[PDB]
Paper text:
Quinol-dependent nitric oxide reductases (qNORs) are membrane-integrated, iron-containing enzymes of the denitrification pathway, which catalyze the reduction of nitric oxide (NO) to the major ozone destroying gas nitrous oxide (N2O). NORs catalyze the reduction of two molecules of nitric oxide (NO) to nitrous oxide (N2O), using two protons and two electrons to cleave the N─O bond and concurrent N─N bond formation: 2NO + 2H+ + 2e− → N2O + H2O. In contrast, qNORs are single subunit enzymes (NorZ), in which electrons are supplied by menaquinol. qNORs are found not only in denitrifying organisms but also in various pathogenic species, many of which lack the full denitrifying apparatus, bringing to attention the role of qNORs in detoxification. Cryo-EM structures unexpectedly revealed AxqNOR to be a dimer.
AxqNOR fused with apocytochrome b562 [BRIL (30)], AxqNOR-BRIL, yielded membrane fractions with high NO consumption rates relative to the total protein content and was chosen for structural studies. Data were processed, with C2 symmetry imposed, providing a structure with a global resolution of 3.9 Å [estimated using the gold standard Fourier shell correlation (FSC) = 0.143 criterion (32)], where local resolution valued the core of the protein calculated at 3.7 Å. Because the BRIL density was at significantly lower resolution, it was omitted during model building, leaving just the AxqNOR model. The dimeric AxqNOR is related by a twofold symmetry axis and exhibits a similar overall structure to those of other qNORs, with 14 transmembrane helices (TMHs) and an α-helical hydrophilic region. The map showed helix pitches and density for bulky side chains, consistent with the estimated resolution, with several hydrophobic interactions between TMHII of each respective molecule, where Leu240, Leu241, and Ile244 act to stabilize the interhelical interaction. The densities of heme b3, FeB, and their respective ligands (His486, His537, His538, and His629) are well defined, where additional conserved residues (Tyr638 and Gly603) provide structural support to Glu490 and His629, respectively. Previous structures of active NORs, including cNOR, have shown the heme b3 Fe to FeB distance to be between 3.2 and 3.9 Å [for NmqNOR and Pseudomonas aeruginosa cNOR (PacNOR), respectively], whereas in AxqNOR, the distance is 4.1 Å. The AxqNOR structure contains the correct nonheme metal at the binuclear center (FeB), but the density for the carboxyl group of Glu490 suggests a different conformation for the side chain compared to GsqNOR and PacNOR, with the carboxyl group approximately 3.5 Å from the His486 NE2 atom. Glu490 in AxqNOR unequivocally faces away from FeB, suggesting that Glu490 and its equivalents in (active) qNORs do not act as an FeB ligand and instead ligate a water molecule along with Glu559. A notable difference was the poor density of Glu494 side chain, which, in the wild-type AxqNOR, was resolved to be facing toward Asn600, forming a hydrogen bond.
Author numbering:
A (entry chain B), B (entry chain A): 1 to 256, 262 to 743
The structure:
């Protein structure tokens, strides 16, 4: 309570109206989803696959890499072409030849211009029709379409089967040699690729958009952005520029501490529990050196084929296996960065004593946390090699969906570990607010943050092996755009301000009101901002209305970062003994520079739904993904490491001269391979994706254009700058642990 | 010179690099203009009109209102449809009917869908070809196109002719009854319309865009935006956001006065010259009341036809006359407000004495201005009614182009009056900085601003009666986007800081650096920002490449207006005698609010070239025009009126209770007639313009859709608030002049 009745009500007011908006629209994503047809038949009488064969074909797609091989409805990896827009153009060109063979005498390519436009108008009448029969379950597609589907089916049966004809196209797609040894799996898998491009073509009931909201930009069947799609883009621009101006207008009008001579953390000297965190500062730097070194190993498969300078490590370590470890070990060391600074802050609040069985609680968390890492990395190896039986795949092995690629049995092992980290926080915080005090204001906010950071991983359930892919793309982003983006940015603002409150630099009054205006602004457009990962995947038009207007308000408090980047840096002059923490106070400054240039600048370039239409599935998304994940949550795990290196080894200097290469190799290393080798490839692809089609921007005839070859062979001029910038950090921490 | 060596070098550096970028591209706008063909002939052998007939048709179009009747290439008025898209659609449907009449047996409307798409591909083949013969001067268009042009000539001959059949379509376009009594004048005007929509269809040499950069969005002949258009749009967006964030960053990191007891302006008491400004302060409010009444009179012709509750004032006072007066008297009173403020500031700088024959120039300049006003209005009335002979039209009468609609002789009169104001400034300012002092830092900037504001009306020359329309649209925006937008915003910052410096509130050190940091920022994207009025008018793609990217940087220093709207309002508390200037210190705050909400927010909504494509010529442009013209330079001539009411009548109070109404009527009326009756009309026109075509968003089958009728019949509820606010302000000024 206290005098904070205004602030503590407007945070619950945001978390009540902007939290039912994932629930009032969460039923809209379910019952407006593209249905899987019960029976696919031809008009002559034969019966093709049904809804059982599609779902078993989905499990065949998961066993080869899932979204880490080639993207489906845009989301995935960006080397192999998306199989819902590469199946589409190969099916329409098969139809255009089977409708020209009995038209004059020739094919679609050898007709003059006025007569070849009399066939693309017949494509719009058949392929933008023949939807479901209103719970009759039948499809009954045309017999000229039954021959074109079976014609292109033999091309995808020959691509995943070790055939000698399609070499040097399995080399530009970074598929190993087989990718599916069994024969009935890839006969069932390419039935699933039909349904993922059946829904991309058929019209919804009465409207002028498709089931996937007109996504794969194809000039044959008239796939152009909607009328309501362009009108909801210009509304999304005026929300931003009238939000930035009205924030600085209300900031400049509605406004209106001697430091101690000793550091108050060295007066405690707690030996038994906080000395056991030396392992956790090793697991951060061991996974960080392993995660960069995979990056130079998965970017090598982009440039070359599968050679690796002599013998090929391609039948053991293919592209979709080294990419799966590159994302998954990245989310671990960001997670165990906060887990070190979380458990360090547990016994420091309740005086300087530990709870009962605290060191016994820490020493069994770490050996269960390392059980998951080397336990999930075996499941990826025994599933992409296709050794494990396919019925037991989802539980241990490989899930298929990116950012949740650890198996279901191992996924409980990550959820049980953070839930065990939850009770080790609450046993050390309930003797601090259940005591009769009157200053439990920051402690009540931090209690709500630790309760939310460990229970929002549980939304990674509610989807199993065989549920509908629109349901698998709704609960998946609840832990990527709400647990990594949202609630890692609440816990890293309070616990950041809790340290500056304890050292005696902020006066605990402007450390709480600054942590409820910077905890409700990030949540105003953060919980209903989940929906900008669900534009073109089985949704209606109001889903891009909630996710393009209420998503610009998480770009409003990110551009204005002059404050909270100077008043976290001018704390250096407030004490003579703030030279010992100079380098953590330089990492919490370069968090702010990449929270406006990775989340604000490069994050709004792809936000409005006319410019996510042409960009979704290109090389402009890993510009935003590399910069907003290492820049914002990747310098916090290195700011909470070189701070926790102090107070547990308070005798070793940080050795400047090494840190000036360990800090200025991460910044300039990240801003040189983005602005030379990932951004200009993302604009040659954008110039082709809006001119010709979506299939043209990922086709292998385009990605070997002799200008996109010299623009990814120049990744290595920035890769080795990042490499030595990462080695100089881990050599410091290993030297610091002695 | 002095300690200001950095700023006074970077301002000349900006005005040196961003000023050759107008000349080196003005050469490109000249030598890449769409040529007028020397001879138009048919393929059978006959000879149609030539280029002289096209130029006489241009003069005939000028004689009836010019751009105030119906827009040409988007620029103009927004009631009658743009003739270069309406002519285009009528000519294309005439060609489709003449090519279907000899195809099977029917027309384009009564053909099935696959066979009517075999004629639009022939429209794409014939109409996107047959350009000029490489300076051969001939056209030699197809005889079917000759028959289609001769067929659609008769409708536009019948529309401007008093013909009975075409009533109640001459009433929804607000044309009086005749608009052209002579017959050869409209017979040549139709040929001019043929030229201005011939340039909208033909392909440039080798490229894939037209001469007017693919402008009139027509799905028949494939008029869709380019790829480089969309690429420069996304580049413009990232330039804006990366500008705002870096400006706030470098503001927050790179930083580092007793008031007197008496007002220092009442200590001078200069009686002979400054008492002669009552005529100017009466002329400002007289033209302001007359202009608001003309605005209320010209919006009635939108809602009703030409009735005016009984007898019609339509053959004497048509829509074109009242619209021309509504723009021109607005520009006149906005100019003479600054003129009176500068002439007040003239003798105060050189101590408290006047130059020789100072009262005589003031006493003749007022009668010269009022002579120019009544002669221009008499010329408009005697030119639109078609009484004055067509040989003598451009000199006195009506020019045709909007914002320069006063005739050439009256234009020389206005330029001579502003030059007389210039020499009256320089005869009073040169004995103040030629004295041996060391404080001529602000006065040099003010002298350069006076030399800028008084000379660049002279770029309204260099185009006469018969030059090419791309040349007439290059020198026209040199006095609308560089003399009104740019150099009225330099003269209003230095004079404001000079007044706040002379009064003894700022310390003259932060009044100079803040008047070059806020004079070099507005000029970085202001002089090469002219080019966003020249996207789709006879230009190439480098012109929009300059005018998007280098124009987003004049939106960057406008959103951040928390500073320069609080440090100009917190000057009120610095003295007890700053209650006498309370209302100018609210006008100079409403200037900042509408400068961020009419130039930033609603001004960037229409800026990027993919969203100016569908918007150019709609009801979203008068939103930005009414907001940024009365909001920024309209409260400035009401701040410099109620400040100059002090120090010449320093005995009459401002009478609060009336000033609250005269402020919060203007603000609430301008913010309520924009957000109710001009913004959703603009959004409905945007939706229909991006769905169907450009002809559909201005057609009279669409602008009576029964929802656009109730959305402009609610203009009056915002009109009467603005009306009563204007009446309260003028009755206050008339009561104060006694
Ligand atoms: C020198 C440093 C790095 C290199 C060479 C590298 C390599 C790569 C490459 C080539 C991709 C593109 C994969 C594809 O095309 O499908 C990628 C994706 C990704 N990287 Fe890195 N990486 C580096 C640093 C990092 C770091 C430090 C992190 C996080 C802690 C990270 C997180 C990610 C993520 C999340 C993706 C997935 C993007 C997406 O699929 O949309 N990267 N990495
Ligand atoms: C602040 C921390 C942020 C993080 C950690 C983050 C992380 C990510 C990642 C890793 C992806 C790639 C997902 C994938 O490959 O499937 C992504 C995509 C995306 N992000 Fe962010 N992001 C952040 C901020 C933002 C912001 C502020 C916006 C504002 C509009 C935004 C808009 C988007 C959009 C539209 C996509 C979809 C791009 C696509 O699917 O191709 N992000 N985000
Ligand atoms: C109650 C107040 C006003 C009313 C009813 C009014 C009426 C109108 C109307 C209906 C238009 C649209 C003409 C068309 O559609 O072609 C217009 C245009 C315009 N008005 Fe006003 N007006 C008002 C106030 C003002 C003021 C105070 C200014 C001060 C400078 C102003 C400047 C302009 C300009 C420059 C245009 C031309 C916009 C363009 O052609 O793009 N108006 N006025
Ligand atoms: C600050 C003072 C400003 C003033 C006095 C002003 C005035 C005007 C006026 C009167 C028009 C209408 C021209 C016509 O009807 O032909 C116009 C158009 C336009 N303005 Fe502004 N403007 C200002 C700021 C801005 C800014 C900051 C931008 C930034 C991008 C901008 C972008 C545009 C564009 C693109 C158009 C063309 C719209 C069209 O032709 O339909 N304006 N301006
Ligand atoms: Ca991805
Ligand atoms: Ca206009
Ligand atoms: Fe997101
Ligand atoms: Fe402009």
């Amino acid at each position: 309570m206290g005098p904070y009745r205004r602030l503590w009500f407007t945070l619950i007011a945001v978390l009540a109206v902007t939290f039912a908006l994932l629930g009032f629209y969460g039923g809209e994503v379910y019952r407006q989803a593209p249905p899987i047809p019960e029976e696919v038949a031809s008009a002559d009488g034969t019966r093709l696959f049904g809804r059982d064969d599609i779902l078993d074909g989905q499990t065949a797609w998961q066993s080869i890499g899932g979204m880490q091989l080639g993207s489906i409805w845009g989301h995935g990896a960006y080397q192999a072409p998306d199989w819902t827009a590469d199946w589409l153009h190969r099916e329409l060109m098969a139809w255009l030849d089977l409708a020209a063979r009995d038209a004059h005498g020739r094919d679609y390519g050898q007709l003059d211009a006025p007569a070849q436009a009399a066939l693309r108008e017949q494509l719009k009448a058949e392929y933008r029709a023949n939807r479901a029969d209103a719970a009759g379950g039948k499809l009954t597609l045309s017999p000229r379409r039954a021959q074109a589907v079976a014609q292109t089916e033999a091309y995808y049966d020959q691509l995943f089967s070790d055939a000698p004809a399609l070499h040097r196209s399995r080399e530009n797609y970074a598929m190993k040699e087989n990718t599916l040894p069994d024969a009935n799996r890839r006969r069932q898998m390419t039935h699933f690729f039909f349904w993922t491009a059946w829904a991309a073509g058929t019209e919804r009931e009465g409207t002028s958009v498709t089931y996937t909201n007109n996504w794969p930009h194809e000039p044959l069947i008239g796939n152009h952005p909607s009328s309501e799609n362009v009108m909801w883009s210009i509304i999304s621009v005026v929300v931003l520029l009238a939000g930035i101006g009205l924030l600085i207008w209300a900031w400049a009008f509605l406004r209106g501490p001697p430091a101690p001579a000793r550091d108050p953390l060295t007066t405690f000297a707690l030996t038994p529990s906080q000395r056991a965190l030396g392992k956790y500062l090793f697991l951060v730097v061991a996974l960080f050196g392993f995660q960069v070194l995979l990056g130079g190993f998965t970017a090598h498969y982009t440039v070359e084929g599968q050679k690796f300078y002599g013998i090929d490590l391609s039948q053991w370590f293919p592209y979709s296996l080294v990419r799966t470890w590159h994302i998954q070990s990245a989310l671990f060391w960001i997670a165990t960065g906060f887990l070190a600074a979380g458990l360090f802050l547990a016994p420091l609040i309740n005086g300087g004593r530990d709870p009962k069985y605290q060191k016994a609680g820490v020493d069994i968390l770490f050996w269960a946390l390392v059980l998951v890492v080397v336990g999930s990395f075996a499941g990826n190896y025994l599933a992409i090699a296709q050794i494990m039986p396919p019925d037991l795949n989802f539980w241990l092995g490989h899930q298929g969906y990116e950012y949740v690629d650890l198996g279901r049995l191992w996924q409980i092992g990550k959820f049980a570990g953070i839930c065990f980290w939850l009770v080790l926080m609450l046993r050390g915080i309930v003797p601090a607010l259940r005591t009769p005090g009157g200053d439990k204001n920051l402690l009540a906010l931090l209690t709500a943050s630790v309760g939310a950071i460990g229970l929002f991983y549980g939304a990674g359930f509610f989807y199993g092996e065989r549920t509908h892919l629109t349901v698998m793309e709704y609960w998946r982003w609840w832990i990527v755009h709400l647990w990594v983006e949202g609630f890692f940015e609440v816990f890293a603002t309070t616990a950041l301000a809790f340290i500056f409150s304890t050292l005696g630099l902020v006066s605990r009054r402007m450390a709480t009101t600054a942590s409820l205006a910077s905890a409700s602004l990030f949540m105003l457009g953060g919980i209903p901002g989940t929906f900008h990962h669900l534009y073109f995947a089985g949704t209606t038009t109001p889903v891009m209305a909630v996710g393009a207007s209420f998503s610009a308000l998480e770009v409003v408090p990110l551009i204005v970062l002059g404050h909270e980047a100077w008043e976290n840096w001018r704390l250096k002059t407030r004490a003579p003994w703030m030279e010992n923490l100079k380098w953590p106070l330089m990492c919490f400054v370069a968090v702010a520079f990449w929270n406006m240039l990775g989340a604000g600048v490069f994050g709004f370039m792809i936000n409005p739904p006319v410019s996510l239409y042409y960009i979704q599935g290109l090389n402009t998304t890993p510009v935003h993904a590399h910069a907003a994940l290492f820049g914002v949550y990747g310098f916090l795990a290195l700011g909470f490491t070189l701070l926790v290196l102090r107070y547990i080894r308070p005798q070793y200097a940080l050795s400047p001269g090494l840190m000036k290469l360990a800090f200025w190799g991460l910044n300039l290393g990240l801003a040189l391979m983005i602005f030379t080798s990932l951004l200009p490839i993302g604009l040659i692809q954008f110039h082709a994706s809006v001119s010709e089609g979506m299939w043209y921007a990922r086709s292998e005839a385009f990605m070997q254009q002799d200008i996109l070859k010299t623009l990814r062979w120049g990744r290595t001029f920035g890769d080795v700058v990042f490499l030595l910038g990462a080695l100089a950090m881990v050599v410091q921490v290993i030297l610091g642990l002695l």
